[PDB]
Design a protein around this nucleic acid. Structure first.
Ligand SMILES: [Mg+2]
Ligand SMILES: [Mg+2]
Ligand SMILES: [Mg+2]
Ligand SMILES: [Mg+2]
Ligand SMILES: [Mg+2]
Ligand SMILES: [Mg+2]
Ligand SMILES: [Mg+2]
Ligand SMILES: [Mg+2]
Ligand SMILES: [Mg+2]
Ligand SMILES: [Mg+2]
Ligand SMILES: [Mg+2]
Ligand SMILES: [Mg+2]
Ligand SMILES: [Mg+2]
Ligand SMILES: [Mg+2]
Ligand SMILES: [Mg+2]
Ligand SMILES: [Mg+2]
Ligand SMILES: [Mg+2]
Ligand SMILES: [Mg+2]
Ligand SMILES: [Mg+2]
Ligand SMILES: [Mg+2]
Ligand SMILES: [Mg+2]
Ligand SMILES: [Mg+2]
Ligand SMILES: [Mg+2]
Ligand SMILES: [Mg+2]
Ligand SMILES: [Mg+2]
Ligand SMILES: [Mg+2]
Ligand SMILES: [Mg+2]
Ligand SMILES: [Mg+2]
Ligand SMILES: [Mg+2]
Ligand SMILES: [Mg+2]
Ligand SMILES: [Mg+2]
Ligand SMILES: [Mg+2]
Ligand SMILES: [Mg+2]
Ligand SMILES: [Mg+2]
Ligand SMILES: [Mg+2]
Ligand SMILES: [Mg+2]
Ligand SMILES: [Mg+2]
Ligand SMILES: [Mg+2]
Ligand SMILES: [Mg+2]
Ligand SMILES: [Mg+2]
Ligand SMILES: [Mg+2]
Ligand SMILES: [Mg+2]
Ligand SMILES: [Mg+2]
Ligand SMILES: [Mg+2]
Ligand SMILES: [Mg+2]
Ligand SMILES: [Mg+2]
Ligand SMILES: [Mg+2]
Ligand SMILES: [Mg+2]
Ligand SMILES: [Mg+2]
Ligand SMILES: [Mg+2]
Ligand SMILES: [Mg+2]
Ligand SMILES: [Mg+2]
Ligand SMILES: [Mg+2]
Ligand SMILES: [Mg+2]
Ligand SMILES: [Mg+2]
Ligand SMILES: [Mg+2]
Ligand SMILES: [Mg+2]
Ligand SMILES: [Mg+2]
Ligand SMILES: [Mg+2]
Ligand SMILES: [Mg+2]
Ligand SMILES: [Mg+2]
Ligand SMILES: [Mg+2]
Ligand SMILES: [Mg+2]
Ligand SMILES: [Mg+2]
Ligand SMILES: [Mg+2]
Ligand SMILES: [Mg+2]
Ligand SMILES: [Mg+2]
Ligand SMILES: [Mg+2]
Ligand SMILES: [Mg+2]
Ligand SMILES: [Mg+2]
Ligand SMILES: [Mg+2]
Ligand SMILES: [Mg+2]
Ligand SMILES: [Mg+2]
Ligand SMILES: [Mg+2]
Lengths: 77, 175, 111, 141
RNA sequence: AAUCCCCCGUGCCCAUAGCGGCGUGGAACCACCCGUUCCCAUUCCGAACACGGAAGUGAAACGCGCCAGCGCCGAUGGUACUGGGCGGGCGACCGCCUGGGAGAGUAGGUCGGUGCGGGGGA
RNA sequence: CACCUCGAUGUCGGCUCGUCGCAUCCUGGGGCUGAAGAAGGUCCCAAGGGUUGGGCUGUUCGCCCAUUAAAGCGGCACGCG
RNA sequence: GCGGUCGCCUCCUAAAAGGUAACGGAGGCGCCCAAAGGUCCCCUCAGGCGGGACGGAAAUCCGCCGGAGAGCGCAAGGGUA
RNA sequence: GCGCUGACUGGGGCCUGUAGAGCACUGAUAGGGCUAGGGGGCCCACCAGCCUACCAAACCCUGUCAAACUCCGAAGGGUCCCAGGUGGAGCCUGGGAGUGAGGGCGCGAGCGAUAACGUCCGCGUCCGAGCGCGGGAACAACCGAGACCGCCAGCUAAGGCCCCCAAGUCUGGGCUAAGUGGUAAAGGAUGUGGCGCCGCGAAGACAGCCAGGAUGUUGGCUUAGAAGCAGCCAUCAUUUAAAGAGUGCGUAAUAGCUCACUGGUCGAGUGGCGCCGCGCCGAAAAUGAUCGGGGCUUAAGCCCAGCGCCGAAGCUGCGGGUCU
RNA sequence: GGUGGGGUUCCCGAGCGGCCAAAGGGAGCAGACUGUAAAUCUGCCGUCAUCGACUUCGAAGGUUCGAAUCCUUCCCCCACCACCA
């Protein structure tokens, strides 16, 4: 017999809205494990590091080098 | 001493077809130039056997010129180990790095009957001007006894130029 | 030694500010003088400046400071500006910086 | 018998034999070499059957370089087969060898002497080979 | 007002701005510096943080330059691979078409650029 | 492995009756021999025919007795209820 | 049947969204902390080298170099000066 | 009911960490150098202590490997926007189901043995339900192609065009002599055709034939004798266009014989290597054989280029049916 | 027949790849003890020879620089496997 045999549930992680999608206040934007997308303008980040639109708007991505990747919501939806 | 081959020009004409044609694709470049060239394969082999990035190939090619090219890469395709592309580096006078063969001249030179010859490098990398190009390098070193290791400045350093360093290294020793 | 306590604590106190997204009232106190800008980030642009250098005053820098404080309100409040966030940068909020701050009232408020 | 000391995982997946490639391939250490014509898992007990064929031909003389190494664990099910329960039971190790790679590669021996040794050495191998010499094409580096 | 150059802030690009070596700056800014009464301080120490200063020095720090030993960036050609279409081999696997096309490596490149506001020069 | 057969494809061994294969046990023909002869060894050709009787065990097989040119090995639903 | 297993977390398998199987490869949980919690204020590692009584490979001290390889209560991953 | 939103496609953004590759991390890892620790061999036993043809840290040169490594990273894939797209498309509400044993094949993996008409997933397809049609001898799932009905009409697909058997004994060019085709591998071979590379050669080579076939000498060693051929070696030296103290037969050791190596004869090629095409060996199983069969050899086989024709329930032509 | 483990000087016996002619015990020879012995203690323990030289691990051959120690091979053992329904 085998002492192996487990695995855990898929956590269905990753990005839930991409650039230039129209979001709404509260929409969550990224589901993620560490801080690998840091919150930008109008983007909150919850205790599971999870990012959500603060305002209705549209989503843009920004790659700031050693500063990291950033998700902003650009208002006036 | 002087290696002339040939060359030609190309723009379109898939290298698959050329290669199928007996002609070895390649490129021609230096600081001032980049150009697509091909050569005959059989022609190139006979020269490159000899030349081998140690010596200057003067090309030629149509609109006949003579370009002081060093060959700086050969890409062989691994399956058949036959060269599938060459790129020729054209000289003009600025100090430039390259590989100069070594000549070990002498007897075992110390601890004879018997030592260990033990050549570490068959070549060396040296920053050298196009004008004076040292086609080989004399290594005598009467000893070379047990426990001695030749580094860099213990080498001839032909009147042309200096090294590509680092001066601390090993070339021959006897253990 | 990479990236000193100075420049950490500096970032640490700055980054928090730049989050709330107000106008930033930045404060540079030197050994002689004390200067203050009011900056709009995302336009990357200074709006209203004040200093002991440009107002050519001296006499006891904590008192000088409060003066470049009242000086900044004045100039700034004039453009519509109210509600900023007080930088304080590397400085403990104390002394000369506390004073430019607590003289930066009558406009540019909540500190 | 070659075999890694201190493995990180015993038992790794089989994976494919595709794409003759990836280094080795140019004869860096010696005067002559054995190059792989076809892909194979080549077994530690195969490599040493080649090594010894050659040292025997040099009468303990010469220099021999090997240059493939069996780091891939080979499992087997005891006899007693039945599919399941687990995976089980590493026998040997193999090195994966795709075409154009140099294994072995002698030096410090007369040409016809080494060429006879490499030919022997080759018969101990499951795939086809090619004997090679060394070249301008094997560059400098 | 503008244009320029130098400094002080403060952003942006996020190493082509970095390490190292050399050189250079004190009028002004900045630093070190002079003190520890006072505010306020260091699990001990005004080191730091803080205040009051202004004699000195640009030694340290910083700013500005220069050098390619390192670091970093890096083609063009050519391959690998491959979306779609076809073949071949007992097999492991291979090949052709059409479109896309790396990685390493070669040539090279670089000792930053730039915005807003100050202070000073013209 | 689980593909036809569980609304049934009777299962070992023996006996009877064979037929086929040849990787040949014997007989026939060969090469080599570390083949003097005789007698072997090994390998090649060859499936025409042959290929014993007993003790023990349900046995196949094996061991053993006495012989023999030899006491062949397989397949045919481990051939054939 | 016997053996193993049965819910939860981490990684790989998984074919660069998600998801994805096998008695496929490996590991972990069934707790814990009144501070290991909120906030404000400071502080920045491991490691290497040189120095220094009892001090040793490493107790504490000083110098320089060290961009994170340390730490984050526990498995792994992601994250993080 | 809504009614242009659909699959698919164009452009644009964003997301990702696989193929490939890489070694910067985690490990593995070949050769070398330089070096802590050390096996030690030992110099002393006080710190000492020189060498490594063993381990082996770090470090540097060279060289690799990895599902649970990644400094890199394609093609693709996903999602939103804007456009095309009127489709037995799409969305919303409801009524009725059936299904929840799948299978083969391709591709990508795992398990297995780089076994299975094996097993387990992924993406695709077909069978299922297209065991209706054509091709593949026959044959669910391979190639062709989606059968509404009728016709003694046409064009094609796949595959075919010597006869069984509809259409070429078609036209060029080349290869193979095995009946290969009508196959099974390592490996082997003056098979045969081609493209090379190297050596030697009219200072006349390769082949034969004519001629010479050392001497100190038994070489010493061993020896009744090895005086090359019972044999372990110093295989050295001379004179020569030139014979190895000698390769084999011989052998009472010798005698005798041959070879090597040269001279001459003659007269144009010769020997080595690598590559490609087709073939040969390797090649033994059980009721009677066979490529489907006859039969085929400048092909009726294989490669290259052509031109025609045959060929389905596909397509067309004519008539008809039903639904929309 | 097939795979698990075993052969150590005359006997039992320990054995790391750098030491292994191989320590540890009994034999077995020599000395001392004793009137002489047995027991006990001492030295010798394959051969010489000063050290050290030299072959021994059942026989052989490999691997390694080095093998009693790894690798097969011919034996030589008792723990185990071979119909079948
Ligand atoms: Mg998971
Ligand atoms: Mg390869
Ligand atoms: Mg082989
Ligand atoms: Mg001054
Ligand atoms: Mg001065
Ligand atoms: Mg006081
Ligand atoms: Mg204190
Ligand atoms: Mg200075
Ligand atoms: Mg690059
Ligand atoms: Mg490119
Ligand atoms: Mg493609
Ligand atoms: Mg590139
Ligand atoms: Mg700036
Ligand atoms: Mg069944
Ligand atoms: Mg099944
Ligand atoms: Mg039944
Ligand atoms: Mg029935
Ligand atoms: Mg019945
Ligand atoms: Mg026969
Ligand atoms: Mg006979
Ligand atoms: Mg006879
Ligand atoms: Mg005979
Ligand atoms: Mg017969
Ligand atoms: Mg009776
Ligand atoms: Mg009976
Ligand atoms: Mg029996
Ligand atoms: Mg009988
Ligand atoms: Mg029978
Ligand atoms: Mg049976
Ligand atoms: Mg039966
Ligand atoms: Mg009956
Ligand atoms: Mg149970
Ligand atoms: Mg995924
Ligand atoms: Mg996917
Ligand atoms: Mg568990
Ligand atoms: Mg430290
Ligand atoms: Mg220390
Ligand atoms: Mg960490
Ligand atoms: Mg539309
Ligand atoms: Mg759409
Ligand atoms: Mg699109
Ligand atoms: Mg890979
Ligand atoms: Mg690595
Ligand atoms: Mg990977
Ligand atoms: Mg890149
Ligand atoms: Mg897109
Ligand atoms: Mg639309
Ligand atoms: Mg529908
Ligand atoms: Mg419904
Ligand atoms: Mg099911
Ligand atoms: Mg299906
Ligand atoms: Mg299924
Ligand atoms: Mg295919
Ligand atoms: Mg199946
Ligand atoms: Mg299968
Ligand atoms: Mg399917
Ligand atoms: Mg059904
Ligand atoms: Mg069908
Ligand atoms: Mg269908
Ligand atoms: Mg049928
Ligand atoms: Mg048919
Ligand atoms: Mg229809
Ligand atoms: Mg056709
Ligand atoms: Mg026909
Ligand atoms: Mg006809
Ligand atoms: Mg004809
Ligand atoms: Mg035939
Ligand atoms: Mg045939
Ligand atoms: Mg013809
Ligand atoms: Mg027609
Ligand atoms: Mg129709
Ligand atoms: Mg009609
Ligand atoms: Mg209808
Ligand atoms: Mg007495």
């Amino acid at each position: 017999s085998t002492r192996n045999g487990r695995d855990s549930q898929a956590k269905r992680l990753g990005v839930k809205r991409y650039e230039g999608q129209v979001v709404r206040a509260g929409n969550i934007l990224v589901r993620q494990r560490g801080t690998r997308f840091k919150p930008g303008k109008n983007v909150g980040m919850g205790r599971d590091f999870t990012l959500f639109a603060l305002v209705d708007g549209v989503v843009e991505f920004q790659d700031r080098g050693r500063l990291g990747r950033y998700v902003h919501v650009r208002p006036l939806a | 001493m002087e290696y002339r081959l040939k060359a030609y020009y190309r723009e379109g004409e898939k290298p698959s077809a050329l290669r199928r044609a007996g002609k070895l694709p390649g490129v021609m470049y230096n600081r001032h130039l980049n150009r697509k060239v091909y050569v005959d394969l059989v022609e190139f082999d006979k020269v490159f056997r000899q030349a081998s990035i140690h010596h200057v190939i003067v090309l030629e090619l149509p609109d006949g010129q003579s370009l002081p090219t060093l060959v700086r890469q050969v890409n062989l395709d691994k399956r058949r180990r036959r060269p599938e592309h060459v790129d020729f580096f054209v000289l003009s006078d600025e100090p430039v790095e390259m590989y100069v063969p070594l000549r070990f001249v002498g007897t075992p030179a110390g601890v004879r009957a018997g030592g260990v010859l033990q050549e570490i490098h068959r070549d060396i990398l040296v920053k050298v001007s196009p004008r004076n190009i040292p086609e080989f390098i004399e290594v005598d070193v009467s000893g070379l006894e047990i426990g001695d290791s030749l580094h860099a400045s213990d080498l001839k350093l032909p009147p042309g130029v200096e090294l590509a360093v680092s001066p601390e290294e090993t070339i021959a020793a006897v253990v | 030694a990479r990236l000193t306590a100075y420049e950490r604590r500096k970032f640490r106190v700055r980054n928090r500010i730049k989050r709330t997204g107000r106008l930033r009232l930045s404060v540079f106190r030197s050994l002689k003088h004390i200067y203050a800008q009011i900056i709009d980030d995302e336009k990357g642009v200074t709006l209203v400046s004040a200093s002991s250098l440009a107002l050519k005053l001296k006499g006891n820098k904590t008192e000088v400071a409060r003066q470049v404080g009242r000086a900044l309100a004045e100039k700034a409040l004039a453009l519509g500006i109210k509600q900023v966030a007080f930088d304080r940068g590397p400085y403990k909020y104390h002394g000369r910086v506390k004073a430019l701050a607590e003289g930066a009232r009558e406009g540019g408020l909540e500190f | 018998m070659l075999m890694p000391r201190r493995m990180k995982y015993r038992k790794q997946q089989r994976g494919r034999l595709k794409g003759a490639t990836k280094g080795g391939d140019y004869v860096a250490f010696g005067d002559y070499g054995l190059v792989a014509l076809e892909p194979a898992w080549i077994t530690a007990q195969q490599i040493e059957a080649a090594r010894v064929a050659m040292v025997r031909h040099f009468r303990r003389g010469g220099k021999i370089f090997i240059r493939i190494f069996p780091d891939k664990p080979y499992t087997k099910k005891p006899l007693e087969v039945r599919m399941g329960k687990g995976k089980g039971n590493v026998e040997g190790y193999v090195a994966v060898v795709k075409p154009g790679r140099v294994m072995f590669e002698v030096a410090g021996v007369t040409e016809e002497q080494a060429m006879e040794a490499l030919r022997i050495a080759g018969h101990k191998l499951p795939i086809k080979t090619k004997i090679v010499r060394r070249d301008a094409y094997d560059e400098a580096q």
